[PDB]
Amino acid sequence: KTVIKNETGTISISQLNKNVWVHTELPSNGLVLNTSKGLVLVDSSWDDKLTKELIEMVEKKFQKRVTDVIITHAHADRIGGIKTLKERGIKAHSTALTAELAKKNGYEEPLGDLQTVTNLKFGNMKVETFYPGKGHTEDNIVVWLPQYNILVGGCLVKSTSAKDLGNVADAYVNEWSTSIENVLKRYRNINAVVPGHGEVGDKGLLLHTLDLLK
Ligand SMILES: [Co+2]
């Protein structure tokens, strides 16, 4: 479907549906939500330079401002553009634990507003955030779009192409399987799963992650 790159192959957006796009930067993924009240991102990018470019590209294309970003854990591939978000007046949502960890690691703090289950609405776009337990990190959350049954797995969920768990320095490899099971129990009918890195898939990516954990 419709894929749009910037100058350089450095940032790509691919349309999942009318109002939901996957953003990918050099490879890390997030979402762009085109809502009636502005653009919402699920995750920004690796660093401030790429976060500024991502925002500029989507603002120009969709002809609306980025208003909000949901930060899925406190690692750099995720927290790295926080300075840019804060100085532009972009609301950076996170769990309290993610914010705690950001501060501990010398980053500016996201809002720490998200609970275990938080339901947000941006214009007409419904967003649910869910902390399923520890896995890739202590703090990792997933994001669910109930109008589309699209799950953003973040780094909790590995792509088909991933043949191992990647960076486990901050991981909880026992608890990770229970956390994925918690996702599977909460969201029994899934149309698409967006991994942290790699190609979009379906529930099979969760089962793949379970197998990688054995
Ligand atoms: Co990570």
Side-chain angles (χ1 to χ4, degrees), residues 44-181:
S44 34
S45 199
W46 305 86
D47 63 12
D48 284 302
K49 190 185 185 282
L50 286 160
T51 293
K52 287 183 188 182
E53 321 171 20
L54 170 59
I55 289 160
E56 290 158 4
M57 172 185 324
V58 299
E59 291 187 341
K60 186 183 169 75
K61 186 188 170 54
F62 301 112
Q63 284 291 304
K64 63 191 71 153
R65 313 319 308 292
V66 169
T67 57
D68 296 80
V69 177
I70 296 168
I71 300 296
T72 67
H73 64 280
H75 276 165
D77 83 326
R78 304 308 182 181
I79 198 68
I82 186 62
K83 184 163 169 254
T84 296
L85 307 183
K86 289 272 278 282
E87 67 193 0
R88 294 180 179 204
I90 296 167
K91 292 170 178 150
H93 307 270
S94 78
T95 62
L97 182 57
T98 294
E100 188 177 28
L101 292 172
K103 181 180 189 174
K104 180 160 62 179
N105 295 132
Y107 294 93
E108 290 169 56
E109 266 185 75
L111 289 168
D113 54 336
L114 305 178
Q115 307 304 305
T116 298
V117 172
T118 296
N119 275 281
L120 303 174
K121 197 165 171 166
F122 303 104
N124 207 224
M125 173 75 70
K126 293 181 181 161
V127 178
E128 180 172 271
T129 69
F130 177 50
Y131 175 63
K134 308 179 197 182
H136 165 75
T137 58
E138 196 182 350
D139 61 321
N140 56 205
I141 64 165
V142 302
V143 181
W144 178 245
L145 272 13
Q147 294 154 314
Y148 306 103
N149 294 13
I150 293 165
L151 184 71
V152 185
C155 292
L156 191 71
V157 180
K158 304 309 285 203
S159 73
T160 300
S161 60
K163 303 310 180 199
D164 56 65
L165 295 165
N167 176 21
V168 302
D170 301 321
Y172 293 78
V173 295
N174 298 306
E175 298 176 70
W176 197 337
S177 294
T178 299
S179 302
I180 289 161
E181 292 286 354

